[PDB]
Amino acid sequence: NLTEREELAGSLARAIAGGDEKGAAQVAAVLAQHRVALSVQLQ
């Protein structure tokens, strides 16, 4: 029972960590569409 927002945010984190520029860019756009409030922290 994971939300769409949760899965999108996790996709974006994984895309960035894996070097997937295209996917990271497109997933970020989709999150921006929903204007999601996210915490983006460094590990």
| Residue ranges in 2-31 that form contacts with its own copies under rule CB under 8 A | 3, 5-6, 9-10, 12-13, 15-29, 31
The minimum distance between CB 18 and its own copies, in angstroms, equals 7
The minimum distance between CB 8 and its own copies, in angstroms, equals 9
Which residue, 1 or 43, has its beta carbon nearer to its own copies?
A: 43
Nearest-5° angle of CA 37, CA 38, CA 40?
150
User: CA-CA distance, 19 to 36, in Å (whole number)?
Assistant: 23
Compute CA 5 distance to the chain's CA centroid, rounded to the nearest angstrom: 8
